[PDB]
Amino acid sequence: MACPPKCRCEKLLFYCDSQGFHSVPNGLPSQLLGLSLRHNQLQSLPNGVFDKLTQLTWLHLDHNQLQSLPNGVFDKLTKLTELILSSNQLQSLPNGTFDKLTNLQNLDLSFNQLQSLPNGVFDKLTNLQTLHLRSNQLQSLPNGVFDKLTSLTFLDLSTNQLQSLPNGVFDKLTNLRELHLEHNQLQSLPNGVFDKLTSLTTLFLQWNQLQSLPNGVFDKLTNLEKLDLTGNQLQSLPNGVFDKLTNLKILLLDNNQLQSLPNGVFDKLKSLTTVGLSGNLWECSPRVCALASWLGSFQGRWEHSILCHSPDHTQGEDILDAVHGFQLCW
């Protein structure tokens, strides 16, 4: 079996990575099971360059400088289970580009420059489990774009430019376990947006710009174990917002604009072991006594100190200290 110069070949797995290549080596064998071309140079791929590689189950093209993808280039890789395209310079995806990859389980498009997704681009990937779209340039999402991804368990949309989520965009993702929406530009959420996500265990919303949470928004996420809302612009929480999250173990509300919390807002979180309430704008008056009391008998931990913001004479002080020092409760 011929191994290309500078490549490393383990039976039917060819490792042609990290060699500063400008092109795909000739002439790969039709029986290749895996091909790695990561960490090369490479700005473009020739039309049909992978067409003979019909048995390929995994292909790695990460950390090159691909500016575009030819039309149909993955066509014929019908056995592909993993496609990694991360860390490139892709601005758009050709229409139907993944349509023949019906066995695809893992698709990684992280660290590219995608400004939009074609309509129906994921529609044939009925077996996809994990979709990585992190650190791209998406401003919106087409409607129904995830509707066929009924096997998806992991979805990462973090660090894009998303200004809104379309209604129902997650409604078909009933097996979803982990959802990353952090570091976008969301200022509100559609009502019922998470409602079908009954198997969800992990939800990341931090460092958006949220000004509100819909009433009942977390109500169906009865299996949720971690919720991160850090660094948004919440000035208040709706009542009963966390009531159904009986398995929640981690709740992070640091660095919002909270002055106060509703009475009994944490009462139903039997499983909680970590809370985060740093930053914020806590008012150290008799308004804090319910929170101070809950904190005092909590049972779990918090990683950063919880401070008074007002009034001026208490600013900087640990809430629990201020309550005694200025006799605010008891």
Residue 98's contacts (CB-CB under 8 Å, 6 or more residues apart) are 74, 83, 104, 107, 121, 122, 124, 125
Contact 7, 16 (CB under 8 A): yes
Burial of 301 (0-12, 13-18, 19+ CB in 10 A): exposed
Terminus-to-terminus CA distance in the chain, angstroms?
81
Tell me which residue of 273, 188, 276 sits closest to 230, measured CA to CA.
276
Cis upstream peptide for 91 (omega within 30°): no
The residue type at 91: Q
The CA-based dihedral angle spanning residues 236, 252, 307, 273, taken in that order and rounded to the nearest 10 degrees: 120
CA distance 60 to 42: 13
Header resolution in angstroms: 2.1
**What's the DSSP call for residue 319?**
H
Residue 297's contacts (CB-CB under 8 Å, 6 or more residues apart) are none
CA–CA distance from 115 to each of 26, 34, 72 (Å)? 33, 30, 21
- Which residues constitute the domain of residue 257? 1-330
Residue 233's contacts (CB-CB under 8 Å, 6 or more residues apart) are 187, 209, 210, 211, 256, 257
What are the backbone angles phi and psi of residue 60, rounded to the nearest 5°?
Answer: -115, 120
**Structural domains of the chain, count:** 1
CA distance 110 to 156: 9
What are the backbone angles phi and psi of residue 292, rounded to the nearest 5°?
Answer: -65, -40
CA distance 229 to 256: 8
Q: What is the CATH number of the domain that holds 8?
A: 3.80.10.10
Tell me which residue of 7, 62, 57, 52 sits closest to 28, measured CA to CA.
52
